[PDB]
Design a protein around this nucleic acid. Structure first.
Lengths: 81, 91, 106, 95, 104, 95, 79, 100
DNA sequence: CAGGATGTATATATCTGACACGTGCCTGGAGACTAGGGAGTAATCCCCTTGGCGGTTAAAACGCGGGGGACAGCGCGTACGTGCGTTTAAGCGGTGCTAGAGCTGTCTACGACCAATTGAGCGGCCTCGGCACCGGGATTCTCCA
DNA sequence: TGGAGAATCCCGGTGCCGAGGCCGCTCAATTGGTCGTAGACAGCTCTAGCACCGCTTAAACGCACGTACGCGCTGTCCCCCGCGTTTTAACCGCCAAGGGGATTACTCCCTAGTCTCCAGGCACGTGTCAGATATATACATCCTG
């Protein structure tokens, strides 16, 4: 179909690493970083879809996602209410 | 003062009918089964608490084992459990 | 008759039922929830002594030491991903040496 | 051509900022096309997809900061994906 | 009158009581437990809000933004110790630059 | 129609108590709301855990100050038990 | 004084199990320090567990739940 | 030479194989007992200990140290080295979340 | 390549105390029976999610030139490593003991259950000013001659 | 060294929509009473922890030396950084439609709770054989040749 994961771009990755505080970045880290973000999205989104499916819902509200990052202890604030 | 000795012992006799188990390995086994027990029951309690459903039943604990174990073992345990509950509701 | 024999399972459904009743998870417990509990725990311990019996079989012993438990958990990738944060007592560490650790030129 | 200092200048530009870094519509199409696997014709909410945004940003800058310390231990200012491999090994995601 | 004024508190003894009643953490409760819970949440909210007010007042700000509470938590050691595994929404990142990457 | 239960105006009162010239935001109000019930969940669940250790159905002030021993750093915890004992003595001295 | 009782050949044996050939001379004392920090945290949780239920001795159950609180849960000693 | 002298590295390989093979006790347990009693009366005196308790903390410390030492070892190979430095274990403690 | 030189896998002789089986007494497990509110199911309505197109314009893609970092190699210093003799106190056996954890029993006060009572609290709607945005000048520092 | 320019900080006006504040209604909070039931405490039992004592003995301790690895230096090459033009496609504001979340209303099932009977599960006793230990032999390494 399409590329989608290549929809995010390399200057976005330089911004993200620039918040982390680097100077020099290799050009081959991008595909591997995209794969890391893909499998992190797998590990949250699977809990998200079964949490949606449990309560007769086909629409993901914010609160079960707060529970999804709560599940592996990476809890997020400002959306649980 | 109860434990999980002889159910797991005859489970071992059913799977591998010609082996034994020491007391330390049985303590490993008992701590394992009660650990996964309170983990899966705490997830079931959270699942009951979350969507104001104050009754715990088969669909909620099915979702709880969807969350707990990873993929392949999750589908295997879910399928074996629903065939067990279908056998129970038939009997 | 016993609900374990009625469901064809092995762990006691009534014992699981009252332990989950008095472990204050909820004040209402359904019918098939301890049946599902007993089924999934018996499946899990079936794999645990499956791999433990195999590890004892390739170590020519018939009594399972928790070393066989350690090679049972740490060799299955899915079960290691599940329970890998749990320390197994007197289990030891697997033989794992890097290739740049042993001397070269044989 | 002005070398080097513009990197630290945008370091200081981005460390004080509070705005979002991945542009949101590629991420929106990404979560649509990965949620097409689990359950088709599935629906979302805007607060939920910003929650995935915030979680992904926090995890990724934690990863990049650990990568920076791996590179400093490597006596390099250049980051290389084996530092990513070490940082994922640290969290136990690999082993 | 009410139990908040009887305990000299602002957090609700009655509502914390009712939440912990139907949250079925235990079968029965004493009387001092919701008072104690209201006290400790009052202290933690007051401490974090004091640090957020300090972080607002050195940045000449009067409306509290998530950047200010991120300054409140991440620049204080025991708040790092207790708020360790969280994610703060729209809060930025603590400035920390290694001296190796600094020029000369 | 239904009652969206929150903790907003109460820490608005404590904010006007401690700092009389500072406002709040709705987003900042959301991090305050999520933070306070998150600490309520851990403190009450761990109090339940200590209730189940001792096989008692009765819960009181003493296992919750034991939970302040557990999930808190030390000096903040001993300030917290001082505050909790002060508040509960002010309540119990009310004739 | 007795923190130094955790001896250098024991750290060598621990390193041989962990997977190391070559060790540095500055390793062992700071390893003893961070190990001491680990037993500091574990022993604080254990002693408040002991003191909460009115006993003046430490059994194995409460230190197992202390490591459960710390996320380092251990089998083979109950719990 | 007339006396046999194994070259260094080979007997290190022998010890890592011999110690990954077995599950025998590693840290010597009565100095550990003196250590926990030292910390115990450092906090609050006249405290008693159980044997199963003291082997529980001993095995927990064994597990924490072998995990930390394997991680700092692989960090030392990552630093293009075969020796562990203290800065390797500083990176291990910082990166694993135990320090910051 | 190659020979000898040692640590280690294997092999049976033997011994012991944990491991599994047997007994029965007993406290949970199950059958029977009642009842009431939790939730299944269905119907209504309305927020709110998705789709989509066009002007604007900020941001991405690609090319080019170079200079500074990544890496290969090298050379020299000493740090543990290996192996010997040396010095230490762990470890098993054995026993006295005493201190506090656990079981039993009984009174008691306090906390769940119920009804009734009412204002704290919470959505709804109005108002103003703090701060983001547009625009412009003062201030730093960085790199070139 | 001196000077040009590129961004950052500060400075001023403004307009807005986000936060404050007041208001009306009602649901949870509170006042009051009861009854029983775990909790508190005391008295007894007894287990498990505590603690000295000697003896053989594995293991720690200490030192020599040497080697090969840690670490600084240097040189080279090409990999990204940084700039600029062209291209990309996303923001926002707008308008349409409906699927599905959220709520209400009814009914019945099944699960809480008591009572009664009973047997499986667990404390206790046991005799025995898998596995720990022992010592001689093949074998699979490594080191100088």
């Amino acid at each position: 179909l399409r590329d989608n994961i290549q929809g995010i771009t390399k200057p976005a990755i330089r911004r993200l690493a620039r918040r982390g505080g680097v100077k020099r970045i290799s050009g081959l880290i991008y595909e591997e970083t995209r794969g890391v973000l893909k499998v992190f999205l797998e590990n949250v989104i699977r809990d998200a879809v079964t949490y949606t499916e449990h309560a007769k819902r086909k629409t993901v509200t914010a609160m079960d996602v707060v529970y999804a990052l709560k599940r592996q202890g990476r809890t997020l604030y400002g959306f649980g209410g | 003062k109860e434990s999980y000795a002889i159910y797991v012992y005859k489970v071992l006799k059913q799977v591998h009918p010609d082996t034994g188990i020491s007391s330390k390995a049985m303590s490993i086994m008992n701590s394992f089964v009660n650990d996964v027990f309170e983990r899966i029951a705490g997830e079931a309690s959270r699942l009951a608490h979350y969507n104001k459903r104050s009754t715990i039943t088969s669909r909620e604990i099915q979702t709880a084992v969807r969350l707990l174990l990873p993929g392949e073992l999750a589908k295997h345990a879910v399928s074996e459990g629903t065939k067990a509950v279908t056998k129970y509701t038939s009997a | 008759k016993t609900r374990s024999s009625r469901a064809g399972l092995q762990f006691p459904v009534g014992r699981v039922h009252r332990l989950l009743r008095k472990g204050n998870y909820a004040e209402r417990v359904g019918a098939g929830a301890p049946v599902y509990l007993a089924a999934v725990l018996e499946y899990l311990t079936a794999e645990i002594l499956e791999l433990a019996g195999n590890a004892a079989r390739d170590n020519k012993k018939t009594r399972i030491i928790p070393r066989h438990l350690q090679l049972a958990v740490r060799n299955d990738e899915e079960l290691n991903k599940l329970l890998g944060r749990v320390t197994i007592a007197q289990g030891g560490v697997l033989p794992n040496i890097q290739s740049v650790l042993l001397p070269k030129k044989t | 051509y002005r070398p080097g200092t513009v990197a630290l200048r945008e370091i200081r530009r981005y460390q004080k900022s509070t705005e979002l870094l991945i542009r949101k519509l590629p991420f929106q199409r990404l979560v649509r096309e990965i949620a097409q696997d689990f359950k088709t014709d599935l629906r979302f909410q805007s607060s939920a997809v910003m929650a995935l945004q915030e979680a992904s940003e926090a995890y990724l800058v934690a990863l990049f900061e650990d990568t920076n310390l791996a590179a400093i231990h490597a006596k390099r200012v250049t980051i290389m994906p084996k530092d990513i491999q070490l940082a994922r090994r640290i969290r136990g995601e690999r082993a």
